[PDB]
Structure formats: C-alpha cells, structure tokens
Design a binder for this molecule. Structure first.
Ligand SMILES: Nc1nc2c(ncn2[C@@H]2O[C@H](COP(=O)(O)OP(=O)(O)OP(=O)(O)O)[C@@H](O)[C@H]2O)c(=O)[nH]1
Ligand SMILES: Nc1ncnc2c1ncn2[C@@H]1O[C@H](COP(=O)(O)OP(=O)(O)CP(=O)(O)O)[C@@H](O)[C@H]1O
Ligand SMILES: Nc1nc2c(ncn2[C@@H]2O[C@H](COP(=O)(O)OP(=O)(O)O)[C@@H](O)[C@H]2O)c(=O)[nH]1
Ligand SMILES: [Ca+2]
Ligand SMILES: [Ca+2]
Ligand SMILES: [Ca+2]
Ligand SMILES: [Cl-]
Ligand SMILES: [Mg+2]
Ligand SMILES: [Mg+2]
Ligand SMILES: [Mg+2]
Lengths: 342, 50, 439, 421
C-alpha cells in the first residue's frame, strides 16, 4: 500500500488524481499532517519543501517543483526571459514586456513607447498582474499606482470565421521526476463569442478570452461551440479548410519549441535529479496566435485546471507517467526532446 | 537562575514528602480504628453477657 | 602562535573527539605515547601544531583538550584505549549518573554540581597558554549532557574568557541513530541558550553522514565508529588552517570574519568530497573540477538542504592534496555557468581558497580510501534554515500537547523557557527568510 | 546510573521473581552457587546492575524476598536457584494476608514493612549509584497488592529521586483465586498511578488465552503462565543488563516511554511464543500482533504513544531497521502523529533456548480496556457493598473504595483524551 496526503482541497485536477489513486486499491489516503506519505498533493503557497525527503524507508514525491514560480508569476517570467542568455532580450516568441512597481523599468518602457509614436507604429499596450488596454502611456501608469507588467498588446490576432473572433491556446504540460517534458496531445482554444474591435479597447469582452469573463459579460456565450471551447480536431479542420495548413505545422512546432525553451532554461535551478525528494508538476501554457500564424507565449500557470471533458484522460495520464513511474502498481503525451549537433 | 531551579526542585520535593506524611497519618488512623472496633466489640459482648 | 582548547561534552562529543585526536596524531606524526620524532625543539616551541598540542620536557605532545561526561563509561574507554598515554588524567572528567536525555537535568540539576570542577580543569589548560585564542566545543544537540551541560558551560566561558572566540561542532539529531523522542526539545533549548555565546557553529546532521556512509562507503548499517571517522575528516579539514602553516582561517577570529557577517546567522554548511570506499579495489582518481563540482551536490553536504533556493553570504574552499590555483579558478568558472549560486546583494560573489599540499590522512583499516586531492566547502547559505524548520515543526507537534514537559519542570526548569526558546527559533527562521528570500 | 534493587512480594511476586532470577542467571552464565561459568565478556560487563560481587568471585542477586506467610519462600529456598539469594534478604511473617489488600497495606503488612526497609537500606547503602527499584507482585491478592504498594510508598519517602518500576500481574476471572480480586486490584492501581514511574501490565487473562489458543495447552497451570512472564521479563530488562545505546537505564526508558506522568502502564509483547528458525519479517509481524500481547487489550482499539522494540540474536541490523520502518509506514494511523519518531529499536547479540526473539513494550491508549474491565467487576460488587466486611473489619471505610474507583475511572478518561487527540 503506497500512501498519499492531500493539502489543496480546491484543486479539481488533484481531487480527480486522488479519486483515481483510491480506486486502484493500492493507495491509502492519510490525514493531511501525517508525515509517513509516499506522495504529497501539496498546497499552492508556502509548501514545506524543507520537510520532504527526511523520512527513512519512504521514497517521497511532491506534485510541485520548488522554484517553478520563476516561470508562473508575470513579473518573474519577464525578468527570467531578459536575463537568461538562452532566452535573451531578443527572444522572438515573447511580447516586449516591462516590470513596473507603484527593480522598476518605467524610463526604459517610456523610451521604447516613444519609438512607436516617432515612427507611426501601432502603439497599444496591456497592463496586468498576478487589467487595462490603452494606446496612451500615462493612463496605464496612473492605473497601476491606483506589482504589474506592461506588455505590448497583439494588435493583429488570428480571427476565427465565422464571428471575426479572438482566442488563446491552453497547452497542458507534465514534467516528471526525471525532467521528461510531456505535452498532452489535447489542447483547448478559449474563444471570444464577440467580433474583434480594434477601435474600442474600453469594451473588454471581445479583447479578453478568459472562461469567466465570456460567461458573464458576453451575450453570445456558446453560439459557435460548447462552452467557449474549440478542441484541436475542429481547429485543425478549420486551418485545413480556410488557410490550407495544419495545426501541427502552423502552430504546434512553435508551441513545442517554446515549452522546451522555457523548461530547459530553469532545469538546473529546479531539477530534483540528485535530491533527497522528487518533484513533478502540471503546467498550463497560454499562447496567442497572430494573423501570420506566429505563436506568442502570454503566460505559464503553475496550478491550472483542465477542460471538463479532458479531466478523465489527463488525470489518468498524471497517475500513469508521474506517479506509477515512481510507485509501480502490481500514450496521450508527446515527449518533448531534441538533440541537434552544433 | 541555577539556585532558582534548585529551590523549585526542593519545593516539589517538600510537597511530595508532606503528601506522604498525610498518607502515614491515614495508615495510623486505619489501624487504630481496627483496634478500637475489636475492643468495642469485646467490651459490648462482655457487658451484654453480665 | 596562539593556543586553542578543545572541549568534548557527552557521549557524541567524546567519541568524535577520540576520532579527531587519533587523526591529528596521524597527520602530525605523533605516536600513541605522545612522542613526535620530527619535532626537533624538545619540551616546547611555537610551531603551528602547538596550537593543539603542548609539550613536556620528556618530548610528550599532549592535546590541549578536556573531555566531560556525566557518566563514566565513554570516557573510561579513552582512559584504557590506544591513546590512553596521550592525556593526563585531569583532562578526563566523569560524573556517576547522566542527564537521562533531559536538557533540564544536564543544565540545572547535574550541571550545577560539576560546572566549577570543569572550569577549574579548563583554567589549568588556559594557564599553560601564552596567547589563548579560545575554544572548540564538540557536543550533540540531542543528549541531556550534550545539550544542557554544554549551554551552561558556554555561558560560564563567556563570563570567564569574555574576549575568546567559541566555535561549536554540533551533532543534529537523526531518527536512524537517535536514542530519545525528546531530542527536538533538547536541540531548541540548547540553541536558544547557546546562540549569543557561540561565534560560529558547524552543524552535522547524523542523517546526512549516515546516508553518505551507506551510499559512498557501502556500509549496510553504519555505526558511530563509521560516522565518527567521516566526521573527523571534515573536522580535520576545518581545523587544518590552525594546525599547519598558511594564510587563511589562521586564527578563530578569522572563521567569524570570513564566514559570519551577521552574528545570529553563524551556521555554515560543510560539504566534503570525495568520499570513496577503501574496499573498492578499482578507483579512478577525481580531478580538481570533479571534487569542486561535488561541493554543490546536496548528497555531499553535512546537512541535507537545497542551496539553489537560498542565498550565499560567504564561501570558503579548503583543498588538501595535489591542487594548484589555476585548476581551482578554471573549476570555479565552469561551475558558475552551470549552477544556481546566488549571493546576497550586500556581499561580493566570491570564494576564499586554501590549499594544503599534504593529501588527506586516513586511519589504517578504516572505511575511507586514500585519495590524491580532497576539498571541504564551508558556505554560509540561508538554505541551512530548512534544518531549523524541521526541528521547530517536531518541537511544535509535541509541545502543543505538553508531551514529556513534566520531566523538564521536575528538574526545576519553568514551562516558560520552552516558549521563550521556541520564540527565539521563530525569530531565527524569520532572520534567514529576510536575508534569503526576494519580494 | 548502575545498581537496581529487586523486591518480590507475596506468592505471585515470589514465584515469577524466582523464575526471573533463574532465567537471567542462566543468560549471564551464573550457576546456582553464584559462580560464573560463561563464555563471553558481554555476560559480565553490566552484571553489577542486578548482582553484588561477594568473596571468591561469587555473584549474589540484589534481591529482597517478602511475604506475610513462609510457604512460598520455603519453596523458593528449595527451588533450583534457591541457594543463590542472600539468606538475610528473606523477610517473612507467619500470619498471611488472606487475599485482603487491607491486611497487606494497613494491619499485617504494617507490622512487617520496617524490617523490609532495613534490608532495602542495607542493599541501597553499598550501591555505587542506585538507579532505583523493581517490584514483582500481583494486584489480586493481599501481600503483593497491599503490602507491595505500602513498600512502594515507603521506598519513595526514603528515595524520592530514584525510579520505581513494577511488574504487576492483573487478575482475571479465568485464572481467579477469590471474588475480591477486583477490589484488591482497584485499590492497588490507585497506588501505582501515583507512586511508580513505569508499570509492566501482565494480564493473567492474556497469559491464559496465549497458553490455551496459541500454545494449545488445554489446562494452563501457573507454571505455564510464568513461562510467558519470565521470557517477557528477560526481554524487557535486556537493555538494562547488556551493553547498548537505547533505554540502557531506568530513567532513560521512562523519559522515552512516559509523556504524561500518570500514563505509565505498558503492554508488553514477545515473539516467538513458546511452551525451528524465525525470519526478521516474522519476528516483527508477531511481536506487534494482539495475540503476542501480555495485556488483553486490542491495540487496534487505541493508539501507540511510544514503543520500545528489542531484537535478540545474530541477525541483519539493516533488515531489523527496514521491517520496523515497514510496520510504522503501513500502520501509521495507530502511532500518534504528535510524538514524532515514537518507536525506538534495540538489538542485542545474545539470544534467550532460541536463535532469535523480539520483545515489545508499548504505551498504548488501548490499555484503558484492562482498567475498564477491572472497573466493571469492582462496581458489580461495590454497588451492593458485597464482601466489604473483610475490609471494614481491618479499619477501612467505604469512602476509600469510592476514591480508588474514581481515580481509576479518571485514568481511563485520560487514556481516552489522548486517543481522540
Ligand atoms: N555522530 C555521532 N552521534 C552520536 C554519537 N553518540 C551519540 N550520538 C548522537 O547524540 C544524540 C544523543 O546524545 P548523547 O551525546 O548520546 O547524549 P549525552 O550528551 O551523553 O547526554 P546524556 O547521556 O543524556 O547525559 C543522538 O542524536 C545520537 O545519535 C557518536 O559517537 N557520533
Ligand atoms: N499581449 C497580449 N495581446 C493580446 N491579448 C492579450 C495579451 N495578454 C493577454 N491577452 C488577453 O488576455 C488573456 C490572458 O490574460 P492573462 O493570461 O494575463 O490572465 P489570467 O492569468 O487571469 C488567465 P489564466 O486563467 O489562464 O491564468 C488572453 O486570453 C488574451 O485574450
Ligand atoms: N501469573 C501468575 N499469577 C498468579 C500466581 N500466583 C497467584 N497468581 C494470581 O495472583 C493473584 C493472587 O495473589 P497472590 O500473589 O497469590 O496473593 P498474595 O500472596 O497475598 O500476594 C490472583 O490474581 C492469581 O490469579 C503465579 O504464580 N503466576
Ligand atoms: Ca617543539
Ligand atoms: Ca562572546
Ligand atoms: Ca502480630
Ligand atoms: Cl579573557
Ligand atoms: Mg494566470
Ligand atoms: Mg551519555
Ligand atoms: Mg495465593
């Protein structure tokens, strides 16, 4: 009997992983503060990593990588990309971003904001934190004061027909205890149900593609697809019919490159390869696609939820590759790897 | 701080030896009660017969 | 030349001191009878080895050492063992009954009756010193004597030798070899009372040494003899700068200056490589780059914790054997580009390096293979606070129910001393977080 | 920490006491004349804990034999190791105690107790550094129960900084001499709760059930019961008697095993059970099995506050550590989470006619079942004041029985409090 504890009651992914472990009959749930566990399904904040791997006779595994927050907080991601040689200031798949406090990057942000004014270039930006869209600098900075990042807003998104409507792509990625990077083969498009309007940023329902914002404010919620959720089989059909390409070629090569670049960058800092306890973590990567079919990373989520119909398959995937790999009982993933010589 | 500790140990000890002293007092009263009841039985049998 | 006095307290302190002095004799060519043929100045001198050894007219080299235990059985093994002639009887102090794994019994009840005798025997060693630097104190956190007697002794040494450095070598408790459920109580009580009296403390987690012995020496079930021979190698690495000619960590004061910029944050992490099995019939000898890279592996640390997730305030590399600065500097450059080494903003990002050309000595018939080069890294990292967090959590679990507290109160300690000691550890955990974590 | 003084009181105390000295004399290579004829230095290293050295390298048990009647001590003096005891350490009256706690504690026992303390003082005075006392007795009779607990109170008065340890045989209707056993046991438990540091609860219910169910003895005798007791007593004193790290003296055992002063009643266990070759997995599973416990309590009905495990024989220390970790990890819910690492393990190289054995000492909240069972038998009689005249005849009042019952019900509540926490 392998043993596990549950320290985050509000996680839908790990409530389902918990139910699956119990139904194998080879896993026993302990009280949350019992130290004699094989597996911690940990809390989101102040997880006590310092108390892991000091139980003699127990191999201990946690479902979070200590230090992964560098990737999964807006301010940290911007700093990590600029300052890591392997991502660099000249990184082509991350929007031009600046950290802004109410250290700071105000006067470097204004300098670049003037080059667009100067050259008559499209000069819309987005302020956000762990939300406002304007082409006027001093209105963004006023709002912040009233820790944030100002990020170039993507003025030319790809638009789904019918509906002339914006979207983002969620990819789920599992990093196992050996630092294999597994991309779940099912992603999801979180769509707008409103047509896109480049002359009205005040109205934020046709600009922001979150599942909560469209469910409340948008008066077309569910008109095109169940939820505001288009899955890969349909989006691939759409790209073949309308644009004469595939999801694999036009978008997924770039997504896989970006996931591998982000996670290979922090590997020396978070790897548990030679450590007294071991880690895995499920990440949610959020992408925008522009009208040239160029892919942009928006953010990395350290504690994502899943689309309703993919819970079953993904959670079984987590027990198969993350947990049973370490604790064997008595593929839905693409393994991201590339060994090019130069 | 060392003398203060020693005085708390001496206090707890004097408290114990007082409690054990009440126990010896009670033991002395049980056996005197046993004697007094045997003597009172003999006495009262002697008087009833007379 | 400036003398150091070593003080070994309780079973762990005494058995580790046995292993250290055995090793020092082998390193300096001192025989079990105290004779040192290579020493041409008979009856005295101010050589570097005289920091740790005094000399009689008859050519006997005598450790500047006191051994204290509250029961006799461990020190009786020194009195009748291989090195019995090395020590004069007045250096070896024993009581009749021990502190029964109880800080309060060591500190208050039995400490009060033996403390004046121990200070008298220490005063006798101090009186033969022309320039006493101070004290090296070896003890467990977990035992009643190691915890309670040591904290009383450290307080009295601050009073009687106010200008003297005090360095500790402290054994942090591990359940794989521990003998008491109350070791976390004893650890927090002694850390609280000692913290203001110690300049620099090297913690050794018995769990880390145990695992190094299992993993790297292939010992199925390590004994204290196995653990102590490894601990003595690391202690010898640390004290070598006091016992040999050199220009780094040459006095006790220099340990504080080089490793401890903030007085309360005085617990450097030791990391040692390489540890190689003597039974291993084929061994490929490790380069300067390999042993230096091994200093950044948690598996080689004296305390298991993750320095990638804290900040450095100081780093010393102490090399023994065939090492030149060129190879050290190339090793460091390679490591900087590959590892997460983050210093605090107010400290230079840098390494102080010491090289002693004499390779590490091993005890004949021991578990350690003879190697051509070895290194001990001493780093002051905030990551060592993980070990405080573990101990504080175990303390909190038991103290919430007052489990075993009546044994401490029964020795004349107040319950208040528990919550005061614990509050001092909360403030220590917070000090490490302020220095270590960003916002 | 060195010398232990052993006291054995009444029929039960002296019968199990004599078997204890036979068994440990054989382990230490001491023959019935007190001469050492053993083959190992391990046998003599801590011999002084239990034995005095006399003229001509003779070893004499630090043992005092007490009874209010001579019969059982005459049988000891004639028994195999009878000539090894110091003759002046036999202290006996002629009256007997009639299975009456009041006679042992207040009337007959009070007459004899001063001459027992004279012998305790003589043994105590020649100790380099006395650790404390162990008493063997039953709680169901009069001398062991009533005079035994009187002695404990007087020893505490004269040696208040020393440890007091008992081997206390709890009565059972299945192995019963009189109906008043529950009265004698309740009055005794009230004394033990206040005046011992550590009590081994040896339940005649459990010993009978082991002899009947496990060892297939159709008709268990006191001899069969005492074979289990002497093997357990050898097991639980191994760490006091042989070189070792863990629980090596009475005060260190108490500090490891007793988190609250009143909860000092231990459930001993032994494996294998005996009237050919046991693996470390099998020792470990059997030593933790309800059927190997010497107190008739289901450990799955409570939680372990603390456990000491002692393995004896030539075996793998790695396999002992792995198996002991396996039991805790697989049954984690039965070990209180608020005493971390509450299971300690010792290994001694000298086995007891076995190649290997394991002794278990548990401080379990399930021990409340033993006290509740005695409490129910006490109340059934006490509600009708049945058989009280035997006690009021010796000067006792009903109120003393009401106080003993309340204190034992309080002890039950306290075990229940830590079981729910
Ligand atoms: N590394 C190592 N640890 C030891 C040694 N001896 C004991 N320990 C550890 O020290 C702690 C117990 O403290 P001891 O030093 O035995 O106790 P003491 O200081 O003698 O105190 P009392 O016996 O209580 O008077 C536990 O954590 C043991 O594992 C030893 O030789 N080496
Ligand atoms: N630079 C940019 N250009 C265009 N649209 C952008 C953008 N940055 C964000 N968005 C819009 O905002 C959405 C994401 O906002 P953001 O990711 O900052 O919030 P959030 O963290 O609440 C989402 P999640 O629930 O996935 O964590 C995208 O779906 C997109 O519609
Ligand atoms: N296990 C065991 N129990 C005994 C023995 N002798 C008596 N008993 C039990 O002890 C109790 C009677 O007390 P006993 O020691 O005979 O009376 P005492 O001489 O007045 O102390 C009853 O519970 C009996 O079941 C014995 O040799 N072994
Ligand atoms: Ca000289
Ligand atoms: Ca000072
Ligand atoms: Ca008489
Ligand atoms: Cl001074
Ligand atoms: Mg987000
Ligand atoms: Mg000791
Ligand atoms: Mg009888």
């Amino acid at each position: 009997m392998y043993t596990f504890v549950v320290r985050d009651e509000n996680s839908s992914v790990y409530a389902e992983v918990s139910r699956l472990l119990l139904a194998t009959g080879q896993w026993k749930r302990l009280r949350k503060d019992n130290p004699r566990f094989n597996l911690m399904l940990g809390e989101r904040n102040r997880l006590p990593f310092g108390r892991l791997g000091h139980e003699p006779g127990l191999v201990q595994l946690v479902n979070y990588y200590r230090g992964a927050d560098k990737l999964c907080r807006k301010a940290s991601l911007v700093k990590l990309i600029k300052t890591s040689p392997e991502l660099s200031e000249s990184c082509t798949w991350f929007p031009e971003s600046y950290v802004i406090y109410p250290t700071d990057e105000r006067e470097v942000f204004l300098a670049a904001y003037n080059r667009r004014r100067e050259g008559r270039e499209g000069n819309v930006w987005i302020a956000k934190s762990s939300i406002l869209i304007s082409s006027e600098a001093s209105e963004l900075l006023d709002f912040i004061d009233e820790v944030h990042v100002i990020q170039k807003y993507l003025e030319k998104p790809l638009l789904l027909e019918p509906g002339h409507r914006k979207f983002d792509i969620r990819s789920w990625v599992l990093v196992d205890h050996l630092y294999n990077i597994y991309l779940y083969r099912e992603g999801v498009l979180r769509t707008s149900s409103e047509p896109y309007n480049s002359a009205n940023f005040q109205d934020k329902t046709c600009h922001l593609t979150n599942h909560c914002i469209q469910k409340e404010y948008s008066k077309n919620y569910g008109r095109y697809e169940e939820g505001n959720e288009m899955f890969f089989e349909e989006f691939n059909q759409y790209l073949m019919d309308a644009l004469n390409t595939t999801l694999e070629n036009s978008i997924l090569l770039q997504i896989k490159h970006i996931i591998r670049s982000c996670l290979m960058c922090i590997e020396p800092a978070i790897s548990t390869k030679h450590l007294h306890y071991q880690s895995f973590q499920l990440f949610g990567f959020d992408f925008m696609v522009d009208e040239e079919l160029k892919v942009w990373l928006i953010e990395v989520n350290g504690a994502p939820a899943c689309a309703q119909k993919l819970y079953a398959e993904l959670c079984q995937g987590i027990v198969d590759v993350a947990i049973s790999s370490v604790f064997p009982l008595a593929s839905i993933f693409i393994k991201l790897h590339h060994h090019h010589h130069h | 701080k060392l003398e203060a500790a020693e005085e708390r140990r001496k206090y707890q000890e004097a408290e114990l030896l007082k409690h054990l002293a009440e126990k010896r007092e009670h033991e002395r009263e049980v056996i005197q009660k046993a004697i007094e009841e045997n003597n009172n039985f003999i006495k009262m049998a002697k008087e009833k017969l007379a | 030349m400036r003398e150091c006095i070593s003080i070994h307290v309780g079973q762990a302190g005494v058995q580790i001191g046995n292993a250290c002095w055995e090793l020092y004799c082998l390193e300096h060519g001192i025989q079990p009878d105290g004779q040192m043929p290579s020493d041409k100045t008979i009856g005295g001198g101010d050589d570097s080895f005289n920091t740790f050894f005094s000399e009689t007219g008859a050519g006997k080299h005598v450790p500047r050492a006191v051994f204290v235990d509250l029961e006799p059985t461990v020190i009786d093994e020194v009195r009748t063992g291989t090195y019995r002639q090395l020590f004069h009887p007045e250096q070896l102090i024993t009581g009749k009954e021990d502190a029964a794994n109880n800080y309060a019994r060591g500190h208050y009840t039995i400490g009060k009756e033996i403390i004046d005798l121990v200070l008298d025997r220490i005063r006798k060693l101090a009186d033969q010193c022309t320039g006493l630097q101070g004290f090296l104190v070896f003890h467990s956190f977990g035992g009643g004597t190691g915890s309670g007697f040591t904290s009383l002794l450290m307080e009295r040494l601050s009073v009687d030798y106010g200008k003297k450095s005090k360095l500790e070598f402290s054994i942090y408790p591990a359940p794989q070899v521990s003998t008491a459920v109350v070791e976390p109580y004893n650890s927090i009580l002694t850390t609280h009372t000692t913290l203001e009296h110690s300049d620099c403390a090297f913690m050794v987690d018995n769990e880390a040494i145990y695992d190094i012995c299992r993993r790297n020496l292939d010992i199925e079930r390590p004994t204290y003899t196995n653990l102590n021979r490894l601990i003595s190698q690391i202690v010898s690495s640390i004290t070598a700068s006091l016992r040999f000619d050199g220009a780094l960590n040459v006095d006790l004061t220099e340990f504080q200056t080089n490793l401890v910029p903030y007085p309360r944050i005085h617990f450097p992490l030791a990391t040692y490589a390489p540890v190689i099995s003597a039974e291993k019939a084929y061994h490929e000898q490790l380069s300067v780059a390999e042993i230096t890279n091994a200093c950044f592996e948690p598996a080689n640390q004296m305390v298991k914790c993750d320095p990638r997730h804290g900040k450095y305030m100081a780093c010393c590399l102490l090399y023994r054997g065939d090492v030149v600065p060129k190879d050290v500097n190339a090793a460091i450059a390679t490591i900087k580009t590959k590892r997460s080494i983050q210093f605090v903003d107010w400290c230079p990002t840098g390494f102080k390096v010491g090289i002693n050309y004499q390779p590490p000595t091993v005890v004949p018939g021991g578990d350690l293979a003879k190697v051509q080069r070895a290194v001990c890294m001493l780093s002051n990292t905030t990551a060592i606070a993980e070990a405080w967090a573990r101990l504080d959590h175990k303390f909190d679990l038991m103290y919430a129910k007052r489990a075993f507290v009546h044994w401490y109160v029964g020795e004349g300690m107040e319950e208040g001393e528990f919550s005061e000691a614990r509050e001092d550890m909360a403030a220590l955990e917070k000090d490490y977080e302020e220095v270590g974590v960003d916002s | 920490m060195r010398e232990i003084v052993h006291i054995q009181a009444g029929q039960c105390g002296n019968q199990i006491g004599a078997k204890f000295w036979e068994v440990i004399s054989d382990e230490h290579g001491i023959d019935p004349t007190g001469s050492y004829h053993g083959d190992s230095d391990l046998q003599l290293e801590r011999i002084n804990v239990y034995y005095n050295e006399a003229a001509g390298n003779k070893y004499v048990p630090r043992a005092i034999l007490v009874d209010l009647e001579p019969g059982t001590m005459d049988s000891v003096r004639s028994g195999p190791f009878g000539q090894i005891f110091r003759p002046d350490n036999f202290v006996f009256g002629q009256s007997g105690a009639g299975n009456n706690w009041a006679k042992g504690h207040y009337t007959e026992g009070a007459e004899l107790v001063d001459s027992v303390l004279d012998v305790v003082r003589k043994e105590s005075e020649s100790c380099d550094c006395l650790q404390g006392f162990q008493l063997t007795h039953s709680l169901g009779g009069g001398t062991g129960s009533g005079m035994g607990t009187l002695l404990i109170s007087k020893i505490r008065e004269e040696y208040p900084d020393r440890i007091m340890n008992t081997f206390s045989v709890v009565p059972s209707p299945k192995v019963s001499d009189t109906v008043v056993e529950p009265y004698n046991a309740t009055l005794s438990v009230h004394q033990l709760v206040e005046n011992t540091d550590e009590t081994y609860c040896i339940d005649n219910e459990a010993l009978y059930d082991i002899c009947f169910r496990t060892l297939k003895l159709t008709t268990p005798t006191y001899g069969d019961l005492n074979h289990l007791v002497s093997a357990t007593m050898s097991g639980v004193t191994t760490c006091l008697r042989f070189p070792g790290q863990l629980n090596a003296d009475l005060r260190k055992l108490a500090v490891n095993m007793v988190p609250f002063p009143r909860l000092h009643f231990f459930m001993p266990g032994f494996a294998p059970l005996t009237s050919r070759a046991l693996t470390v997995p099998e020792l470990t599973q059997q030593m933790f099995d309800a059927k190997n416990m010497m107190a008739a309590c289901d450990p799955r009905h409570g939680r372990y506050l603390t456990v000491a495990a002692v393995f004896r024989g030539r075996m793998s220390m790695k396999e002992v550590d792995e198996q002991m970790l396996n039991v805790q990890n697989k049954n984690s819910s039965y070990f209180v989470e608020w005493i971390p690492n509450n299971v300690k393990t010792a290994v001694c190289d000298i086995p007891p006619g076995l190649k290997m054995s394991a002794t278990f000492i548990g401080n379990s909240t399930a021990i409340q079942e033993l006290f509740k069972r005695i409490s129910e038998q006490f109340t059934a009689m006490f509600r009708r004041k049945a058989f009280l005249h035997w006690y009021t005849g010796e000067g006792m009042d009903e109120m003393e029985f009401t106080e003993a019952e309340s204190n034992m019900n309080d002890l039950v509540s306290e075990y229940q409090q830590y079981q729910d926490a």
